[PDB]
Structure 1
Amino acid sequence: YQNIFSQVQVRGPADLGMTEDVNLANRSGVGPFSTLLGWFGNAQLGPIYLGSLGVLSLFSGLMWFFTIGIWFWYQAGWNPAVFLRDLFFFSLEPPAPEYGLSFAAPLKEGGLWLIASFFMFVAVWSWWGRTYLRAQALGMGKHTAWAFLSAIWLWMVLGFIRPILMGSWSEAVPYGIFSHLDWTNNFSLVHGNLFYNPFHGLSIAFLYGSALLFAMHGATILAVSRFGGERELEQIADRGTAAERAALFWRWTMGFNATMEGIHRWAIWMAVLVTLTGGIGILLSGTVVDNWYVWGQNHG
């Protein structure tokens, strides 16, 4: 037995969770218990804290989602056969270059893209405020919110910051499955191949390292789960043979090692540096560097 799935589930009363300073008025009640989920992790769905930023995000994010789909249905001539057939092929495209950074564009040739983007802007930032506020309620550090900001960075660059600096909304990414892929491939071609963007290449090393490190870490905690390894917080406050055997596996393999707390600083950083370096690479593309081949040839 290797501890990828549980051999036995137990259930007790619904866990309505810790209280600290949270407003209990805004938490739901428990949802079902999924026995399926329970083989891998926890069986309990809910509760969920809603509140004001909860509903703003949730309404706002559905308005973005519906806006795109209503335009996909329109493109499909309102035919459910064509809709399902061409699903990956439809695209809400930003305004033409003609309209620059203007909100003048008609609904069928930009305006609809802008409406959907506004909604998405409210949805994401309100959700960011939510990850901070939930943590504050429980008296926890703001790690989750600051780590999330790194993801927001690259998104803000692609759809907002870079389209502004370049003086056109047409530079932004379209809402569509195959269209957003073509954009990505188009961007690289037009900027002389992103492989020569040194930020793109760091972005990849970190994406990579995220895969290699969570592979290492997950594997390591499962390997020492026979000494209560998963109980990271109590192993922090009172190091056990699990923390010791874990540190020593890696010391003896590759010559150095982590703490039970310290591995999590490695973890949060490896990950945020993906979108951090990624966003810088993109912001500098067409604003400062026209061609990463050409730039690379000068080195500067």
Structure 2
Amino acid sequence: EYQNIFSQVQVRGPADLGMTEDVNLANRSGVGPFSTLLGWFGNAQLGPIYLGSLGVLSLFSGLMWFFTIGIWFWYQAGWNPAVFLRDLFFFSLEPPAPEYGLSFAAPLKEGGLWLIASFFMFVAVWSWWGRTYLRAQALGMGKHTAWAFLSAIWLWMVLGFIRPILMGSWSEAVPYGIFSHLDWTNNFSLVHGNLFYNPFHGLSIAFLGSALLFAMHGATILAVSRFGGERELEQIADRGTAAERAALFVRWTMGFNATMEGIHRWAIWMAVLVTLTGGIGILLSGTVVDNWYVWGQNHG
């Protein structure tokens, strides 16, 4: 039997400049190359990418945030490339010491460089949020991507912005670094008495869930690619045999059934709920509840 995890044959035509609609087109670039390497898995055409006003602001700010941390890494590395490459996972840009609190003016070598990179990160992400909205609006589509993106922003915002303000200090935030933000994730669980006893942590894991649903849905459409199941919209507006067998495999296996549009309702909600409950769990941790083992002792 043939599977369908790689393509046997590749075809290529003129570069697809894409749908037009109310897009500006002046901000679309020259089409990139066609990589045969990607063509085996998915598509092969690179670009054209749209870069508007916000597209530059974010991309600029994102390089500004990225470079700010790496400059600090070079300082710590004694401007030595060997110490840089070796200790790379170990360098870290920590927030200001708790003595400063929420004071927006701290010395650079003692946390002031943190707030500089955070401002770039704050404007880079949000200008990218607005970018995902207007790219849907320009094609006359639902904004569902910008709405699910807010859920990721939510956890991100609670981790390094809302919770620090609620706890009255910048030091409660997350440092920029590999091995450092791993230790932060650890001690947070320990300062608050095992996050396992956080009911929102438990639900966030449960929705993470997504790996189950995305394993099933991927396998199902591949299983029915012989009937053209990958064309998922024309099967919504005109159910084929591909969508019927997919529904009945779910019916005959576990019971309740799923439609073509119905299964994607599950899909987006399984993900968005990961960071939705996760942000709530972190927001209450420390601000309202000091120890989840002690909280869980009172069963709530």
* TM-score between the two structures when normalised by the length of structure 1: 0.99
Q: Encode CA deviations 1:100-149: one digit per residue, 9 max, x unaligned.
A: 00012100011100000000000000000000000000000010000000
Query: Cα distance, 1:257 vs. partner?
Result: 1.5
Unpaired segments ≥5 residues, structure 1: none
User: Residue 28 of structure 1: CA displacement?
Assistant: 0.5
User: In the TM superposition, what are the counterparts of 1:127-142 in structure 2 within 5 Å?
Assistant: 127-142=128-143
Alpha-carbon RMSD across the aligned residues, in angstroms, is 0.4
The secondary structure found in structure 1 opposite 2:265 is: helix
3-state SS, counterpart of residue 11 of structure 2: strand
Paired residue secondary structure (2:89): coil
Instruction: State the 1:88 CA deviation.
Output: 0.3
Q: Residue deviations 1:50-92, cap 9 Å, x none?
A: 0100000000000000000000000000000100000000000
Distance (whole Å) between structure 2 residues aligned to residue 98 and residue 147 of structure 1: 37
Task: Summarize the alignment of residues 55-204 of structure 1 with structure 2, pairs less than 5 Å apart.
Answer: 55-204=56-205
Shift of 1:298: 0.7
1:16 touches 1:29 (CA, 8 Å); kept in 2? Answer: no
Distance between the aligned counterparts of 2:286 and 2:109, measured in 1?
27
Q: Offset at 1:29?
A: 1.5
Structure 1 consecutive aligned stretches of length 4 or more whose deviation exceeds 4 Å: none
SS in 2 for 1:257: coil
3-state SS, counterpart of residue 92 of structure 1: coil
The alignment partner of 2:99 has SS state of: helix
Q: Deviations over 1:193-216 (max 9, x none)?
A: 000000000000000x10000000
Between the aligned partners of 1:26 and 1:172, the Cα distance in structure 2 is: 37
C-alpha separation in 1, matches of 2:52 and 2:206: 39
The alignment partner of 2:193 has SS state of coil
- 8 A Cα contact 1:31 1:44, kept in partner: yes
Equivalent in the alignment of 2:22: 21
Structure 1 residue matching 2:88: 3-state secondary structure = coil
Query: 3-state DSSP class of the match of 2:21?
Result: coil
Distance 1:56 1:294 in 2: 46
Equivalent residue of 1:82, what SS?
Answer: helix
- Secondary structure of the residue aligned to 1:97 is coil
* 1:244, distance to aligned residue in structure 2 (A): 0.2
SS in 1 for 2:266: helix
Identity of aligned residues (%): 100
CA distance in structure 1 between the aligned counterparts of 2:18 and 2:135, rounded to whole angstroms: 13
- Cα-to-partner distance string for 1:214-256 (whole Å, 9 max, x where unaligned): 0000000000000000000000000000000000011000011
Partner SS, residue 88 of structure 1 = helix
Distance 2:46 2:27 in 1: 16
Aligned length: 299
Q: CA deviation at 1:299?
A: 1.8
